[PDB]
Protein backbone atom coordinates (compact mmCIF):
# COMPACT_ATOMS: atom_id res chain seq x y z
CA UNK A 1 0.00 0.00 0.00
CA UNK A 2 1.08 3.63 -0.65
CA UNK A 3 -0.20 6.41 1.62
CA UNK A 4 2.28 8.81 3.20
CA UNK A 5 2.22 8.47 6.99
CA UNK A 6 4.03 10.44 9.65
CA UNK A 7 4.10 10.43 13.43
CA UNK A 8 5.20 13.03 15.99
CA UNK A 9 5.69 12.06 19.65
CA UNK A 10 6.10 14.38 22.64
CA UNK A 11 7.90 12.55 25.47
CA UNK A 12 7.29 13.15 29.14
CA UNK A 13 10.45 14.18 30.97
CA UNK A 14 11.47 14.41 34.62
CA UNK A 15 14.43 14.77 36.97
CA UNK A 16 13.34 12.91 40.13
CA UNK A 17 15.96 14.65 42.30
CA UNK A 18 14.89 18.12 41.04
CA UNK A 19 11.29 18.96 42.00
CA UNK A 20 11.90 22.59 40.98
CA UNK A 21 13.33 21.55 37.61
CA UNK A 22 12.15 23.58 34.62
CA UNK A 23 10.88 21.15 31.93
CA UNK A 24 11.83 23.56 29.14
CA UNK A 25 15.45 23.55 30.30
CA UNK A 26 15.51 19.77 30.72
CA UNK A 27 14.03 19.15 27.26
CA UNK A 28 16.43 21.62 25.66
CA UNK A 29 19.41 20.02 27.39
CA UNK A 30 18.28 16.54 26.32
CA UNK A 31 18.00 17.61 22.68
CA UNK A 32 21.31 19.47 22.84
CA UNK A 33 23.02 16.47 24.44
CA UNK A 34 21.81 14.18 21.68
CA UNK A 35 22.86 16.67 18.99
CA UNK A 36 26.32 17.00 20.53
CA UNK A 37 26.68 13.22 20.76
CA UNK A 38 25.78 12.91 17.09
CA UNK A 39 27.84 16.01 16.30
CA UNK A 40 15.44 22.10 15.85
CA UNK A 41 17.95 19.46 14.78
CA UNK A 42 17.72 17.19 11.73
CA UNK A 43 18.85 13.66 12.55
CA UNK A 44 20.52 11.38 10.02
CA UNK A 45 17.25 9.50 9.46
CA UNK A 46 15.31 12.53 8.33
CA UNK A 47 13.46 12.79 11.63
CA UNK A 48 13.17 16.06 13.56
CA UNK A 49 14.29 16.32 17.18
CA UNK A 50 13.27 19.54 18.91
CA UNK A 51 11.54 21.08 21.94
CA UNK A 52 7.85 21.96 21.90
CA UNK A 53 5.45 22.81 24.73
CA UNK A 54 8.18 21.98 27.25
CA UNK A 55 8.62 18.44 25.92
CA UNK A 56 11.24 16.82 23.71
CA UNK A 57 9.46 15.96 20.46
CA UNK A 58 10.62 13.40 17.91
CA UNK A 59 9.03 13.52 14.44
CA UNK A 60 9.61 10.46 12.30
CA UNK A 61 10.35 10.69 8.56
CA UNK A 62 7.44 10.11 6.22
CA UNK A 63 6.72 6.48 5.32
CA UNK A 64 4.26 4.71 3.04
CA UNK A 65 4.44 1.23 4.57
CA UNK A 66 3.08 1.16 8.15
CA UNK A 67 5.83 -1.30 9.12
CA UNK A 68 8.43 1.35 8.28
CA UNK A 69 6.39 3.80 10.33
CA UNK A 70 6.49 1.56 13.40
CA UNK A 71 10.21 0.95 12.91
CA UNK A 72 11.01 4.65 12.89
CA UNK A 73 8.70 5.29 15.86
CA UNK A 74 10.68 2.72 17.85
CA UNK A 75 13.85 4.41 16.56
CA UNK A 76 12.55 7.59 18.18
CA UNK A 77 12.22 5.72 21.46
CA UNK A 78 15.86 4.64 21.15
CA UNK A 79 16.90 8.22 20.34
CA UNK A 80 15.28 9.45 23.55
CA UNK A 81 17.06 6.74 25.53
CA UNK A 82 20.42 7.65 23.98
CA UNK A 83 19.84 11.34 24.70
CA UNK A 84 19.13 10.65 28.36
CA UNK A 85 22.24 8.47 28.55
CA UNK A 86 24.39 11.22 27.04
CA UNK A 87 22.99 13.76 29.50
CA UNK A 88 23.65 11.48 32.48
CA UNK A 89 27.24 10.87 31.38
CA UNK A 90 28.27 14.44 32.26
CA UNK A 91 29.76 14.47 35.80
CA UNK A 92 27.54 16.33 38.23
CA UNK A 93 24.49 16.16 35.94
CA UNK A 94 21.04 15.58 37.41
CA UNK A 95 19.41 12.34 36.27
CA UNK A 96 16.87 12.62 33.45
CA UNK A 97 14.07 10.11 32.86
CA UNK A 98 11.80 10.08 29.80
CA UNK A 99 8.44 8.41 29.24
CA UNK A 100 6.62 7.59 26.01
CA UNK A 101 3.15 8.36 27.31
CA UNK A 102 0.57 11.16 27.22
CA UNK A 103 -0.53 12.13 30.76
CA UNK A 104 0.88 12.76 34.21
CA UNK A 105 -2.28 11.75 36.06
CA UNK A 106 -2.76 15.28 37.44
CA UNK A 107 -4.48 17.00 34.51
CA UNK A 108 -1.73 17.65 31.99
CA UNK A 109 -1.76 15.95 28.61
CA UNK A 110 0.74 15.96 25.76
CA UNK A 111 0.03 14.17 22.52
CA UNK A 112 1.45 11.76 19.95
CA UNK A 113 0.10 12.83 16.56
CA UNK A 114 -0.43 10.90 13.33
CA UNK A 115 -0.38 12.53 9.88
CA UNK A 116 -1.93 11.00 6.75
CA UNK A 117 -1.78 12.32 3.20
CA UNK A 118 -5.16 12.29 1.41
CA UNK A 119 -6.63 13.77 -1.75
CA UNK A 120 -7.64 17.42 -1.73
CA UNK A 121 -10.66 16.50 -3.86
CA UNK A 122 -12.16 14.36 -1.09
CA UNK A 123 -14.72 16.41 0.88
CA UNK A 124 -13.80 16.82 4.52
CA UNK A 125 -17.43 16.22 5.50
CA UNK A 126 -17.00 12.70 4.16
CA UNK A 127 -13.83 12.39 6.23
CA UNK A 128 -15.60 13.53 9.39
CA UNK A 129 -18.63 11.31 8.87
CA UNK A 130 -16.76 8.15 7.88
CA UNK A 131 -13.80 8.45 10.24
CA UNK A 132 -15.53 9.48 13.48
CA UNK A 133 -16.95 6.03 14.39
CA UNK A 134 -13.72 4.24 13.49
CA UNK A 135 -11.64 6.70 15.52
CA UNK A 136 -13.99 6.36 18.48
CA UNK A 137 -13.80 2.56 18.35
CA UNK A 138 -10.16 1.85 17.48
CA UNK A 139 -8.98 2.39 21.07
CA UNK A 140 -10.05 -1.18 21.91
CA UNK A 141 -7.21 -2.20 19.59
CA UNK A 142 -4.77 0.71 20.07
CA UNK A 143 -5.53 1.83 23.63
CA UNK A 144 -2.41 2.15 25.76
CA UNK A 145 -4.06 1.89 29.17
CA UNK A 146 -4.39 4.32 32.06
CA UNK A 147 -4.95 4.02 35.81
CA UNK A 148 -7.38 6.63 37.08
CA UNK A 149 -10.59 7.93 35.52
CA UNK A 150 -11.37 11.57 34.78
CA UNK A 151 -9.16 14.46 33.68
CA UNK A 152 -7.68 14.65 37.19
CA UNK A 153 -8.04 10.91 37.82
CA UNK A 154 -10.01 11.33 41.04
CA UNK A 155 -12.14 8.25 40.24
CA UNK A 156 -10.58 4.80 40.77
CA UNK A 157 -10.39 2.48 37.80
CA UNK A 158 -8.53 1.37 34.70
CA UNK A 159 -9.48 2.69 31.27
CA UNK A 160 -8.31 1.81 27.78
CA UNK A 161 -7.04 5.19 26.63
CA UNK A 162 -4.87 7.89 28.16
CA UNK A 163 -6.24 10.61 25.83
CA UNK A 164 -9.93 9.77 26.26
CA UNK A 165 -10.56 12.10 29.22
CA UNK A 166 -9.05 15.04 27.30
CA UNK A 167 -11.27 14.80 24.20
CA UNK A 168 -14.00 17.44 24.39
CA UNK A 169 -15.41 18.16 20.90
CA UNK A 170 -16.27 16.18 17.80
CA UNK A 171 -14.31 18.45 15.44
CA UNK A 172 -11.78 21.11 16.32
CA UNK A 173 -8.61 22.94 15.37
CA UNK A 174 -6.74 23.42 18.64
CA UNK A 175 -4.41 20.68 19.87
CA UNK A 176 -3.55 22.04 23.34
CA UNK A 177 -7.13 22.35 24.61
CA UNK A 178 -10.69 21.47 23.61
CA UNK A 179 -9.20 18.61 21.64
CA UNK A 180 -11.46 16.92 19.12
CA UNK A 181 -12.05 13.45 17.71
CA UNK A 182 -11.27 14.91 14.28
CA UNK A 183 -8.71 17.70 13.84
CA UNK A 184 -9.28 20.23 11.07
CA UNK A 185 -5.71 21.55 10.83
CA UNK A 186 -4.74 22.04 7.18
CA UNK A 187 -1.14 22.66 6.15
CA UNK A 188 -0.08 20.14 3.47
CA UNK A 189 3.58 21.15 3.02
CA UNK A 190 2.89 20.14 -0.59
CA UNK A 191 0.61 20.96 -3.51
CA UNK A 192 -2.54 22.00 -1.66
CA UNK A 193 -4.41 21.73 -4.96
CA UNK A 194 -4.32 17.92 -4.97
CA UNK A 195 -3.04 16.84 -1.53
CA UNK A 196 -4.34 17.49 1.96
CA UNK A 197 -2.81 16.34 5.26
CA UNK A 198 -5.16 14.88 7.83
CA UNK A 199 -3.97 15.30 11.41
CA UNK A 200 -5.00 12.84 14.13
CA UNK A 201 -4.45 13.71 17.80
CA UNK A 202 -6.69 11.17 19.56
CA UNK A 203 -4.20 8.28 19.64
CA UNK A 204 -2.18 7.21 22.65
CA UNK A 205 1.54 6.68 22.42
CA UNK A 206 2.09 2.94 21.89
CA UNK A 207 5.00 0.69 22.83
CA UNK A 208 3.80 -2.70 21.55
CA UNK A 209 4.63 -2.92 17.87
CA UNK A 210 1.34 -4.60 16.94
CA UNK A 211 -0.55 -1.71 18.54
CA UNK A 212 1.32 0.91 16.51
CA UNK A 213 1.19 -1.23 13.37
CA UNK A 214 -2.59 -1.58 13.52
CA UNK A 215 -3.08 2.06 14.55
CA UNK A 216 -1.33 3.20 11.38
CA UNK A 217 -2.33 0.48 8.91
CA UNK A 218 -6.03 0.26 9.71
CA UNK A 219 -6.36 4.05 9.71
CA UNK A 220 -4.71 4.19 6.28
CA UNK A 221 -7.05 1.51 4.90
CA UNK A 222 -10.14 3.22 6.33
CA UNK A 223 -9.02 6.46 4.68
CA UNK A 224 -8.76 4.45 1.45
CA UNK A 225 -12.40 3.48 2.03
CA UNK A 226 -13.30 7.16 2.45
CA UNK A 227 -11.53 8.32 -0.71
CA UNK A 228 -13.12 5.59 -2.84
CA UNK A 229 -16.53 6.93 -1.82
CA UNK A 230 -17.65 3.76 -0.05
CA UNK A 231 -20.74 4.45 2.04
CA UNK A 232 -20.27 4.59 5.81
CA UNK A 233 -23.24 6.79 6.74
CA UNK A 234 -24.95 3.86 8.46
CA UNK A 235 -22.17 3.89 11.10
CA UNK A 236 -22.64 7.47 12.37
CA UNK A 237 -22.71 7.69 16.17
CA UNK A 238 -25.34 9.51 18.21
CA UNK A 239 -22.89 11.23 20.61
CA UNK A 240 -19.29 10.52 19.57
CA UNK A 241 -17.56 12.45 22.38
CA UNK A 242 -19.63 10.60 24.95
CA UNK A 243 -18.79 7.39 23.06
CA UNK A 244 -15.04 7.90 23.53
CA UNK A 245 -15.51 7.98 27.30
CA UNK A 246 -17.95 5.06 27.41
CA UNK A 247 -15.68 2.79 25.38
CA UNK A 248 -12.51 3.81 27.21
CA UNK A 249 -13.87 3.07 30.70
CA UNK A 250 -14.89 -0.57 29.98
CA UNK A 251 -11.88 -2.91 29.68
CA UNK A 252 -14.24 -5.91 29.41
CA UNK A 253 -15.13 -4.62 25.90
CA UNK A 254 -18.85 -5.29 26.43
CA UNK A 255 -20.01 -1.65 26.56
CA UNK A 256 -22.10 -0.38 23.65
CA UNK A 257 -22.54 3.02 22.04
CA UNK A 258 -25.74 4.12 20.34
CA UNK A 259 -25.66 4.76 16.61
CA UNK A 260 -27.63 7.57 15.02
CA UNK A 261 -29.99 4.93 13.58
CA UNK A 262 -30.73 3.60 17.08
CA UNK A 263 -28.51 0.51 16.96
CA UNK A 264 -26.25 -0.13 19.96
CA UNK A 265 -22.83 -1.57 19.09
CA UNK A 266 -19.68 -2.43 20.98
CA UNK A 267 -16.39 -1.04 19.74
CA UNK A 268 -15.41 -4.55 18.62
CA UNK A 269 -18.54 -4.72 16.45
CA UNK A 270 -17.70 -1.37 14.83
CA UNK A 271 -14.15 -2.57 14.21
CA UNK A 272 -15.47 -5.77 12.61
CA UNK A 273 -17.74 -3.79 10.26
CA UNK A 274 -14.89 -1.52 9.18
CA UNK A 275 -12.63 -4.54 8.74
CA UNK A 276 -15.24 -6.23 6.53
CA UNK A 277 -15.59 -3.19 4.29
CA UNK A 278 -11.81 -2.69 4.08
CA UNK A 279 -11.38 -6.36 3.16
CA UNK A 280 -14.02 -6.02 0.45
CA UNK A 281 -12.16 -3.01 -0.95
CA UNK A 282 -8.78 -4.75 -0.84
CA UNK A 283 -10.06 -7.96 -2.46
CA UNK A 284 -11.57 -5.88 -5.27
CA UNK A 285 -8.17 -4.40 -6.19
CA UNK A 286 -4.84 -5.81 -7.28
CA UNK A 287 -2.89 -7.94 -4.78
CA UNK A 288 -1.26 -5.92 -2.00
CA UNK A 289 0.65 -8.16 0.42
CA UNK A 290 1.02 -5.40 3.03
CA UNK A 291 -2.68 -4.54 3.02
CA UNK A 292 -3.54 -8.23 3.27
CA UNK A 293 -1.12 -8.64 6.17
CA UNK A 294 -2.63 -5.65 7.98
CA UNK A 295 -6.10 -7.12 7.47
CA UNK A 296 -4.91 -10.50 8.78
CA UNK A 297 -3.33 -8.96 11.89
CA UNK A 298 -6.43 -6.82 12.50
CA UNK A 299 -8.75 -9.81 12.15
CA UNK A 300 -6.61 -11.95 14.46
CA UNK A 301 -6.52 -9.25 17.13
CA UNK A 302 -10.27 -8.69 16.92
CA UNK A 303 -10.91 -12.43 17.24
CA UNK A 304 -8.57 -12.74 20.23
CA UNK A 305 -10.02 -9.70 22.02
CA UNK A 306 -13.54 -11.05 21.58
CA UNK A 307 -12.48 -14.46 22.93
CA UNK A 308 -10.70 -12.99 25.95
CA UNK A 309 -8.72 -9.72 26.34
CA UNK A 310 -5.83 -11.41 28.17
CA UNK A 311 -5.08 -13.43 25.03
CA UNK A 312 -3.59 -10.17 23.70
CA UNK A 313 -1.47 -9.57 26.82
CA UNK A 314 1.65 -10.45 24.77
CA UNK A 315 0.46 -8.55 21.68
CA UNK A 316 -1.12 -5.21 22.65
CA UNK A 317 -0.24 -2.42 25.10
CA UNK A 318 -3.33 -2.10 27.24
CA UNK A 319 -3.86 -5.87 27.82
CA UNK A 320 -0.18 -6.29 28.79
CA UNK A 321 -0.35 -3.33 31.17
CA UNK A 322 -3.62 -4.61 32.62
CA UNK A 323 -2.13 -8.06 33.17
CA UNK A 324 0.62 -6.46 35.25
CA UNK A 325 -1.83 -4.25 37.15
CA UNK A 326 -4.24 -7.09 37.92
CA UNK A 327 -1.38 -9.33 39.00
CA UNK A 328 -0.17 -6.74 41.50
CA UNK A 329 -3.71 -5.98 42.67
CA UNK A 330 -4.24 -9.67 43.40
CA UNK A 331 -0.85 -10.13 45.07
CA UNK A 332 -1.05 -7.08 47.34
CA UNK A 333 -4.85 -6.85 47.83
CA UNK A 334 -4.74 -3.32 46.45
CA UNK A 335 -7.43 -0.90 45.32
CA UNK A 336 -7.26 1.07 42.09
CA UNK A 337 -6.08 4.15 44.04
CA UNK A 338 -2.97 2.33 45.26
CA UNK A 339 0.17 4.39 44.43
CA UNK A 340 2.03 1.29 43.25
CA UNK A 341 -0.53 0.72 40.48
CA UNK A 342 0.03 4.29 39.31
CA UNK A 343 3.77 3.62 39.41
CA UNK A 344 3.32 0.49 37.28
CA UNK A 345 1.23 2.45 34.78
CA UNK A 346 3.85 5.20 34.62
CA UNK A 347 6.98 3.03 34.45
CA UNK A 348 5.50 0.88 31.68
CA UNK A 349 6.48 3.64 29.24
CA UNK A 350 9.90 4.47 30.73
CA UNK A 351 12.22 4.43 27.72
CA UNK A 352 15.10 2.80 29.63
CA UNK A 353 15.69 -0.71 28.31
CA UNK A 354 16.64 -2.08 31.74
CA UNK A 355 13.93 -0.25 33.76
CA UNK A 356 10.97 0.24 31.40
CA UNK A 357 8.37 -2.38 32.27
CA UNK A 358 7.47 -2.83 28.60
CA UNK A 359 11.16 -3.23 27.77
CA UNK A 360 11.42 -5.91 30.47
CA UNK A 361 8.37 -7.73 29.08
CA UNK A 362 10.10 -7.65 25.69
CA UNK A 363 13.44 -8.86 27.08
CA UNK A 364 11.91 -11.90 28.81
CA UNK A 365 9.83 -12.82 25.75
CA UNK A 366 6.43 -11.81 27.18
CA UNK A 367 5.60 -9.46 24.28
CA UNK A 368 5.47 -10.15 20.56
CA UNK A 369 7.58 -8.12 18.15
CA UNK A 370 6.86 -7.54 14.47
CA UNK A 371 10.35 -6.13 13.77
CA UNK A 372 13.89 -6.97 14.84
CA UNK A 373 16.05 -4.77 17.03
CA UNK A 374 18.55 -4.75 14.17
CA UNK A 375 16.00 -2.96 11.97
CA UNK A 376 15.26 -0.42 14.71
CA UNK A 377 18.94 0.29 15.36
CA UNK A 378 19.64 0.62 11.64
CA UNK A 379 16.70 3.04 11.49
CA UNK A 380 18.30 5.12 14.24
CA UNK A 381 20.95 6.25 11.73
CA UNK A 382 19.48 5.76 8.23
CA UNK A 383 16.51 7.09 6.25
CA UNK A 384 13.51 4.99 5.13
Amino acid sequence: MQRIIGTEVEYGISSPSDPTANPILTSTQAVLAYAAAAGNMILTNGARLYVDHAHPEYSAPECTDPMDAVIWDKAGERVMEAAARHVASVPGAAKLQLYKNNVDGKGASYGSHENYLMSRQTPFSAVIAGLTPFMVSRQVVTGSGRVGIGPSGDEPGFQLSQRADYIEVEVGLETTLKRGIINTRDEPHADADKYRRLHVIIGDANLAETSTYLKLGTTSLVLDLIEEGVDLSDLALARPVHAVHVISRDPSLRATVALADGRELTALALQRIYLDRVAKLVDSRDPDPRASHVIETWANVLDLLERDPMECAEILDWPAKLRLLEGFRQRENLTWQAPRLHLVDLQYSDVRLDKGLYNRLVARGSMKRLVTEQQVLDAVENPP
Binding site: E10, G12, I13, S14, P16, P19, P23, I24, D52, H53, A54, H55, V103, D104, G105, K106, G107, A108, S109, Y110, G111, H113, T175, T176, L177, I201, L324, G327, F328, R331, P339, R340, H342, L343, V344, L346, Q347, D354, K355, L357, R360, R364, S366
Partner: peptide
Protein backbone atom coordinates in the same frame (compact mmCIF):
# COMPACT_ATOMS: atom_id res chain seq x y z
CA UNK B 1 4.45 -18.21 35.27
CA UNK B 2 2.60 -15.13 36.51
CA UNK B 3 4.41 -15.39 39.84
CA UNK B 4 7.76 -15.20 38.05
CA UNK B 5 6.64 -12.25 35.91
CA UNK B 6 5.37 -10.30 38.91
CA UNK B 7 8.56 -11.05 40.85
CA UNK B 8 10.78 -9.86 38.00
CA UNK B 9 8.70 -6.70 37.52
CA UNK B 10 8.49 -5.98 41.26
CA UNK B 11 12.29 -6.08 41.48
CA UNK B 12 12.59 -3.14 39.06
CA UNK B 13 9.71 -0.96 40.32
CA UNK B 14 11.13 2.30 41.63
CA UNK B 15 11.27 2.85 45.37
CA UNK B 16 8.83 5.07 47.27
CA UNK B 17 5.93 4.65 44.87
CA UNK B 18 3.75 7.35 46.43
CA UNK B 19 6.44 10.04 46.36
CA UNK B 20 7.69 9.14 42.88
CA UNK B 21 4.14 9.21 41.50
CA UNK B 22 3.43 12.54 43.17
CA UNK B 23 6.67 13.93 41.74
CA UNK B 24 5.74 13.30 38.10
CA UNK B 25 4.34 16.62 36.87
CA UNK B 26 4.31 17.64 33.21
CA UNK B 27 3.53 20.74 31.18
CA UNK B 28 0.49 20.31 28.99
CA UNK B 29 1.36 19.83 25.34
CA UNK B 30 -0.52 19.10 22.13
Amino acid sequence: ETDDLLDEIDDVLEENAEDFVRAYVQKGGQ
